[model samples]
Target: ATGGYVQQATGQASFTMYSGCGSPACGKAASGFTAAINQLAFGSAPGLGAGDACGRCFALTGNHDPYSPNYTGPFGQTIVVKVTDLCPVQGNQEFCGQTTSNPTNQHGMPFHFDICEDTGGSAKFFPSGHGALTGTFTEVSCSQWSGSDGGQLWNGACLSGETAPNWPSTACGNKGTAPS
Candidate 1:
């Protein structure tokens, strides 16, 4: 079973480069920009749940409409990304799970990602100052090492430790079915 969800509006998608910050959840704290690795940060809502969405892979397709510049890449191209960190929490202005009052941070969109610009996938899709792009997205399997092809943890190691809030693997499982 594959979990699938779609956004009605493609313009809601956004991108961000890595700022100087520490990801306590990720074993290796990250800062600045590095083309060596590809990853993304998610908001508290999508970051927390029955199964932690961290390390999960998301396949994003740019909007095809000529009116929107979001999809400057080739037609039918899918940019795949891995969850590497958590988007800054809203309202409380903290990290990960915080408060709810502030939704303006990411424009109140339920699904948004701060993509790493140095990463080949994002670099190819968005130009500097491009900001947000229009696109649909879905979760995909991580059964094999995808590198920058479409999945995270290409090495297939999702970290090790006792966990509940932490995800054990980057492997995508049967959560729901995606539409064709």
Candidate 2:
């Protein structure tokens, strides 16, 4: 939490599951609950890999009640996550909100937070059946890389090759869990 990296962004969250390279930025597939920011803020090109947003760490705090009336999950929970991918654009849909230069989600806040769902981390922190949730995020220093309450990547070799490869394990040395 003290790496001193301080890029900040805002957004409403959409809980969807993601797989593959994430182009989210990685060689191996991204495991666990990682986040894909809006293409606008991410400044992505046509496909993937673009903005400095990739590989950056963010602490996600969400509000589920109003977002999902009966939503049941940890309230006031804050999970630190890595920017692994970019959200794909949909036409005139809630996800379409991701296409615009909109700062947030369809609701208009920040960039959309396409949080990977059905993971060890999202299942716990992200409420099921929620259309959109309220929240904002900021960059966390590599020093702030968390693998506890926030969950960790199962294969994180590409995250920071500076560390050892923990692919199929904990390359980044983060101990967080994924895949619920």
Candidate 3:
């Protein structure tokens, strides 16, 4: 059984971009959602999937990169994001692909985030060619975010025919830092 989640955590992040619409880890409400404002999948958040990892917000600050210690990205700048997905245990070898028996990512961190890039596109939290980004993540309140940032799918509201799920929806595996 998994224990309660911690309030703060650090991980190696990769802010790669993707576009799709379907059963997102959060739910269908966040179909077209974008990065930072959309997802923060965890390697150890759950071994199976994005179970209950939705709507959990976080404030992230990236440090130096692996290959490029001086790699330029979103260093020192704190960005906010909400949980919407997970790094499948068998997802990727270099990243994700963790298990209780062997819970570590490509960067040998307990946690990792494959942040779905945003539409408006912010600077890469984890720069390219840097191999991996060392980031400081703190679970925060969803209220701190309005879901209207450039990172979000559609300003605070869900797109087209979707219904917005509540922050840390009852179905979420981990509740937001500040549960309302």
**Number of the top candidate by TM-score?**
3
For residue 118, give model 2's deviation from the true position in Å: 6.0
CA RMSD of each candidate after superposition: 9.9, 9.9, 7.9
Q: lDDT by residue for model 2 over 1-180, one digit each (tens)?
A: 011111244435544434343334332334445666554444343333333455556667776545456766555457766666556444324542443333345565545556665344465455545535666675555345544122233343244521322122222222211101
| Count of backbone collisions within predicted model 1 | 4
lDDT of 2: 0.46
* Candidate 1 Cα errors over 4 Å, as ranges: 1-12, 19-24, 28-51, 64-76, 90-108, 143-145, 148-180
Clashing pairs in 3: 52-172, 52-173
Winner on lDDT between 1 and 3 is 3
lDDT score, candidate 2, position 79: 75
lDDT of 2 at 127: 52
Q: Per-residue lDDT tens digits of candidate 1, residues 1-180?
A: 123322221234434344332332232322222111111222123223211344455566655433354545454345665555445443223112212333223233334555555444556555555444545555444432144222232342232111212232323221222212
The C-alpha stretches of model 2 lying farther than 4 A from their native spots are 1-32, 65-76, 91-104, 147-180
Report how far off residue 155 is in candidate 2 (Å): 18
lDDT of 3 by residue, 43-107 (tens): 12322333344555566666767657665564535666555655454445555544455555566
What's the ranking of the predictions by TM-score, best on top?
3, 2, 1
Question: Which pairs in model 1 have colliding backbones?
Answer: 1-174, 2-176, 3-176, 10-134
Better of 1 and 3 by TM-score: 3
Among these predictions, the greatest lDDT belongs to 2
